[PDB]
């Protein structure tokens, strides 16, 4: 449920980019759900997906 930077270090670039793409599409779905009216549970997840994207990008760089 929680994406952490400790276990992303050994992985190589390809699956890191794949996971980044999955996080991006999840974030887009979260945003459209927020606009059309969704549960507070889905609203709260936006920050966690944004921070997971930040973690993945930081590890890549």
């Amino acid at each position: 449920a929680k994406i952490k930077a400790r276990d992303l270090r050994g992985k190589k670039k390809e699956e890191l980019l794949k996971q980044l793409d999955d996080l991006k599409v999840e974030l887009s779905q979260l945003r459209v759900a927020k606009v059309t009216g969704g549960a507070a549970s889905k609203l709260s997840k936006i920050r966690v997906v944004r921070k997971s994207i930040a973690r993945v990008l930081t590890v890549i760089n």
Binding site: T36, G37, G38, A39, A40, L43
Partner: protein, 444 residues
């Protein structure tokens, strides 16, 4: 009946004491009846009325479940004005109970003519009157409780509670009961679970025990209980399906609310009416056929014969179009009579779907009505006028009603096909009936 200040724990206690008032009538057997040879006008018909045999409340819920329709029918043609003042109000509720006594008199005519109560001459006019009056007293405690509840002392509506502890209790008895029935093959208790434990003592062989576990036709089969839990679970998952509509206050910022549109927009009315039409087609056909027979039309409606099914023989629509509408008795019966088997599905599915679609517009739950409601609660949707409110609601409401009817019909059909304990109509009533109680309790 008046109203007073009440609190939630006192409210559940009031639901409790009302349910034991129901239970003392449900448990105690009636006296003065000495005719048990027939005892099968319709199993399904009894369920809708929550009626009983040889019990205090065998009277049924018919009057309380119809009298209300008469008041609504008069209002539509505006024949009479219902109470709009407290003294006028304190009348219809009661007068309806008095009209219920007239409905009980109709039941007394039905009881003597059907012959389940007995021959009219053998009881005699006076003795027939004594039993009819005594049944009305058992019904009357329910009818006065209905007025007490109608005012609001009772939680919601008691009609659901009577079914809630009527169709479910029977499933609970089938699951475990300490009475033993012996054909001499083995010693087993009435409860399906107890019967399996008794079978293990009866037979050392593991294979015979698994054969009994799969198939135990004379007693409730163990497999049926497993199916009953599975069908309850699938109906729960279907019950959850909802549509979230962004609803916002007309004068506040950043306020996010959702107006829920559940898949089952009509919660139980399609099934209560449907379980009602299928029971009726059969109930009149058996009664009319017995009084007057040898007419091609009455045989064409239905032919009736009783075959024992792990209990007393049940009159089946052996002949007539009601047979095609009638359920398939066995998986082999579906193979042997796909026609009636299938007809049995289109009529039930279609009736619920038609009854739902029509129920949403009968009860004032249409998109326009609910939009008007949201208007009197100063509720709006973001970036939308009220006409678009109606249009947005229309995108879901009729489709939601139709597919809710379709889903409940399909779920009942699947539950019956899997051979779970109890009628599919009964299982449907139980889940929705508990859910209305569940929402009130969570609301507390």
């Amino acid at each position: 009946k008046p109203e007073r200040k009440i609190q939630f724990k006192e409210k559940v206690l009031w639901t409790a004491i009302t349910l034991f008032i129901f239970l003392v009538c449900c448990q105690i057997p009636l006296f003065g009846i000495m005719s048990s040879d027939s005892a099968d006008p319709f199993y399904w018909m009894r369920v809708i009325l929550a009626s009983n045999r040889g019990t205090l409340m065998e009277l049924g819920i018919s009057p309380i479940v119809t009298s209300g329709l008469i008041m609504q029918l008069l209002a539509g043609a505006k024949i009479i004005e219902v109470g709009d003042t407290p003294k006028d109000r304190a009348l219809f509720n009661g007068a309806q109970k008095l009209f219920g006594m007239i409905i009980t008199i109709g039941q007394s005519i039905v009881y003597v003519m059907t012959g389940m109560y007995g021959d009219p001459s053998e009881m005699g006019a006076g003795i027939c009157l004594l039993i009819t009056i005594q049944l009305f007293v058992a019904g009357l405690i329910v009818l006065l409780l209905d007025e007490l509840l109608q005012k609001g002392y009772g939680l919601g509506s008691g009609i659901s509670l009577f079914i809630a502890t009527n169709i479910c209790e029977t499933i609970v008895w089938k699951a475990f009961s300490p009475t033993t029935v012996n054909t001499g093959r083995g010693m087993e208790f009435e409860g399906a679970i107890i019967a399996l434990f008794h079978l293990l003592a009866t037979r050392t062989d593991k294979v015979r025990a698994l054969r009994e576990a799969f198939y135990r036709q004379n007693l409730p089969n163990l497999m049926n209980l497993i199916a009953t839990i599975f069908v309850f679970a699938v109906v729960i998952y279907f019950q959850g399906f909802r549509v979230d509509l962004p609803i916002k206050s007309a004068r506040y910022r950043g306020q996010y609310n959702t107006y829920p549109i559940k898949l089952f927009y009509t919660s139980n009315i399609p099934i209560i009416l449907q379980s009602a039409l299928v029971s009726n087609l059969y109930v009149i056909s058996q009664m009319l056929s017995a009084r007057f027979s040898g007419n091609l039309l009455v045989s064409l409606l239905g032919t009736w014969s009783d075959t024992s099914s792990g209990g007393p023989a049940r009159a089946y629509p052996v002949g007539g179009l009601c047979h095609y509408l009638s359920p398939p008795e066995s998986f082999g019966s579906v193979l042997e009579d796909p026609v009636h088997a299938v007809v049995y599905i289109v009529f039930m599915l279609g009736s619920c779907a038609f009854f739902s679609k029509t129920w949403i517009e009968v009860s004032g739950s249409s998109a326009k009505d609910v939009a008007k409601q949201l208007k009197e609660q100063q509720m709006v949707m973001r970036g939308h006028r009220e006409t678009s409110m109606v249009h947005e609601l229309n995108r879901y409401i009729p489709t939601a009603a139709a597919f809710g009817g379709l889903c409940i019909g399909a779920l009942s059909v699947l539950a019956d096909f899997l051979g779970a304990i109890g009628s599919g109509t009964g299982i449907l009533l139980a889940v929705t009936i508990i859910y209305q109680y569940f929402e009130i309790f969570v609301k507390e």
